[PDB]
Symmetry: C3
Subunit: 96 residues, 3 copies
């Protein structure tokens, strides 16, 4: 640690006094997990908005074929081929 930064943080540990072991365990779990969970939600919200706004959802339902194949069908075809999927989305790789 940078001692000057520790000097800012160390005093804030007093704010956790009186919490139970269970509370501190939950807090530690949260500290370890929240950043990835928040990032994934942010990215998925961005994706969902694009998918609806650009018109994709008009032909692609999650689990039923309509005008186009379901997203289940698409996901099956591109399982383990995300690089190729991105290339398809960019117009660089033809449809499978």
């Amino acid at each position: 640690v940078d001692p000057a930064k520790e000097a800012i943080m160390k005093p804030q540990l007093t704010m956790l006094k009186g919490l139970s072991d269970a509370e501190l365990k939950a807090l530690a779990d949260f500290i370890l997990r929240i950043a990835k969970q928040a990032q994934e939600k942010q990215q998925q919200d961005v994706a969902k908005a694009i998918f609806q706004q650009k018109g994709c959802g008009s032909c692609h339902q999650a689990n039923v074929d309509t005008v186009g194949p379901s997203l289940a069908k698409i996901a099956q075809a591109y399982a383990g081929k995300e690089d190729q999927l991105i290339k398809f989305l960019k117009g660089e790789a033809p449809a499978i």
Copy 2:
């Protein structure tokens, strides 16, 4: 691909022009994951409604024993035995 179906889809790739690599990565992640996530939510909503409406929740809380064992206790007993659990629910297998 069916060329006649490609003729419908290929033009829609123009709707993704101007999006960043990060946006396209999020979109691809979404395409790969959403169908399973949507199906699991749909199924879990169906299950939760049955569980409450049929009266199960009156005797079975998630993590505390009341009239009957907690769902944690039940899940422990049936861990790796979902086929047997379904048979129990149907009246075909006696309680453990």
Copy 3:
């Protein structure tokens, strides 16, 4: 099973009559998964409230460094060291 407890439960299986195999599969999935999911939500709500109420969020954003390091940065440093993280939170282990 305790026969006296089976006598309470067995009759309630009549409440599942007329449900499809798919409905019963969803119900069994729910029975197997809900207790852990409910416990984890309860714990994470407790943690989130502590984190905000005690002032931690004023210096620790999820994915950007501000006054203090991001929670992503913290999680990286403490990956596989949750015991040490808890000890740090208690004032027992110095910062890394």
